[PDB]
């Protein structure tokens, strides 16, 4: 009886195995745009993905993830609210069964069709497993997806999903350029939070971009053909793998823009 997103093991159950689920800096949250305050102390944000080295794509049983070589400073996030250098380890998505839901963060209670998370760890802690034990160990760049025009830079991801339909399947996924998944503007909101799945560790500086990317209905439909189950098990479509907004508690969301 492991955690997931079903009726009997979904987000409302997670606290029993992971009591930090009810903690003081849980994610995601609703971003109330009128209350977020512009912070002119924020330094410019820096997304340096030109030397990114993608390796593999994996169906992990709750989403799919594209993994990178993080054994060197090759794809890094710096600047913004961050002190130091954070290395890209993987990206993944959360999405809905219908276009009206799927994102984890919301904006004035609006849900997007999906949300991309580019996960990075602070190089001062040496490895990802040590970084997640630190309050400033991770920086996750969140990007909303809305349904409209296709995102050309996403198509290479969508076309390999057939090959990783079920839990535990992976495929070679080299030479993928994550710059093709970014919107034009790097305007963002930032706040201190957590992993949005178990173990729910409170180790993340969240940086959520204001501008969504557009993906086509066909692209998102292919996400919804994935399976939570393993091969040869009853088919359970991988949809609605998002955690709802959590209490903001004693936090302020800051904006990089006026
Ligand atoms: C190093 C601690 C640890 C973290 C994570 C996992 C296993 C982990 O190891 S363990 N021993 O607890 O099973 C698998 C689930 C992973 C999580 C790191 C944070 C992850 C990438 C999440 O990223 S997110 N949504 O941006 O917070 C979604 C999947 C998460
Ligand atoms: Zn995520």
Residue 91 sits in a domain whose CATH number is: 3.10.200.10
Q: Which two tokens stand for residue 43?
A: 């330094």
Resolution reading in Å: 1.5
Distance 70 CA to ligand 1 centre (A): 16
199 Cβ closer than 6 Å to some ligand 1 atom: yes
Contacts of 117-120 with CB under 8 Å at 24 or more apart are 117/91, 117/92, 117/93, 117/141, 117/142, 117/196, 118/77, 118/88, 118/91, 118/142, 118/143, 118/178, 118/181, 119/88, 119/89, 119/90, 119/91, 119/92, 120/76, 120/77, 120/86, 120/87, 120/88, 120/89
Contacts of residue 126, defined as CB under 8 A and 6 or more positions apart, other chains included, come to none
> How many domains are there within the chain?
1
Distance of CA 73 to CAs 52, 66, 67, 153, Å?
Answer: 9, 17, 15, 23
User: How far is the centre of ligand 2, averaged over its atoms, from the C-alpha of 134 (Å)?
Assistant: 18
Residues spanned by the domain of 196 = 1-258
Q: Is 92 annotated as a binding residue?
A: yes
C-beta of 197 in contact with ligand 1 (< 6 A): yes
Question: Does 123 carry a binding-site annotation?
Answer: no
Which method was it determined by?
X-ray
117 is in an annotated binding site: yes
> SS3 of 249, please?
coil
Number of other CB atoms surrounding residue 153 within 10 Å: 16
Q: Is residue 155 left, alpha or beta, with left meaning phi > 0 and alpha meaning psi from -120 to 50?
A: alpha
119 lines ligand 1 (CB under 6 A): yes
Active site residues: 62
From ligand 2's centre to the CA of 193, what distance in Å?
A: 12
Element (H, E) at 165: none
120 in a labelled binding site: no
Query: How many angstroms does the Cα of residue 119 sit away from the middle of ligand 1?
Result: 10
C-alpha to C-alpha distance for 59 and 166, rounded to whole angstroms:
6
Q: Is the peptide bond before 28 cis (omega within 30 degrees of 0)?
A: yes
Whether residue 20 has its Cβ less than 6 Å from ligand 1: no
Buried residues in 74-89 as b, exposed as e (16+ CB within 10 A): bbbbbbbbbeebbbbb
Ligand positioned closest to the Cα atom of 103: 2
Omega cis (within 30) before 199: yes
Distant-in-sequence contacts of 33-41, Cβ < 8 A, 24+ apart: 33/107, 33/108, 34/108, 35/253, 36/189, 36/252, 36/253, 36/254, 36/255, 37/252, 37/253, 37/254, 37/255, 38/254, 38/255, 38/256, 38/257, 38/258, 39/254, 39/255, 39/256
Tokens of 83: 């002190």
Instruction: Map 99-153 to HEC letters.
Output: CCCCCCCEECCECCCEEEEEEEEEHHHCCHHHHCCCCCCEEEEEEEEEECCCCHH
Helix (H) or strand (E) holding 226: none
CB 196 near ligand 1, within 6 Å? yes
Q: 106 vs 24, 180, 205, 235, 251, CA distance in Å?
A: 19, 23, 17, 29, 16
Q: Is the dihedral of CA 104, 157, 50, 61 positive or negative?
A: positive
3-state secondary structure of 223: helix
Which ligand sits nearest to residue 66's alpha carbon?
1
Spatial separation of the C-alpha atoms in residues 84 and 131, rounded to whole Å: 13
CA gyration radius, the chain: 17
d(CA 146, CA 115): 9
């Amino acid at each position: 009886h492991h955690w997931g997103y079903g009726k009997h093991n979904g987000p409302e159950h997670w606290h029993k195995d992971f009591p930090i689920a009810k903690g003081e800096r849980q994610s995601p949250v609703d971003i109330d745009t009128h209350t977020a305050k512009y912070d002119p102390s924020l330094k410019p944000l820096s997304v340096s993905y030109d030397q990114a080295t993608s390796l593999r794509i994996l169906n992990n049983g709750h989403s799919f993830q594209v993994e990178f070589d993080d054994s060197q400073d090759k794809a890094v996030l710096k600047g913004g609210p961050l002190d130091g250098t954070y290395r890209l380890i993987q990206f993944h998505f959360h999405w809905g069964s219908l276009d009206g839901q799927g994102s984890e963060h919301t904006v004035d209670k609006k849900k997007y069709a999906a949300e991309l998370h580019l996960v990075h760890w602070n190089t001062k802690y040496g490895d990802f497993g040590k970084a997640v034990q630190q309050p400033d160990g991770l920086a996750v760049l969140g990007i909303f997806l809305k349904v409209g025009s296709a995102k050309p830079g996403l198509q290479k991801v969508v076309d390999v999903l057939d090959s990783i339909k079920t839990k535990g399947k992976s495929a070679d996924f080299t030479n993928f350029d994550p710059r093709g998944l970014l919107p034009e503007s790097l305007d963002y909101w930032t706040y201190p939070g957590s992993l949005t799945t178990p173990p729910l560790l409170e180790c993340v500086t969240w940086i959520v971009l204001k501008e969504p990317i557009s993906v086509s209905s066909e692209q998102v439909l292919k996400f919804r053909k994935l399976n939570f189950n393993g091969e040869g098990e009853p088919e359970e479509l991988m949809v609605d793998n998002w955690r709802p907004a959590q209490p903001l508690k004693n936090r302020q969301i800051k904006a990089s823009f006026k």
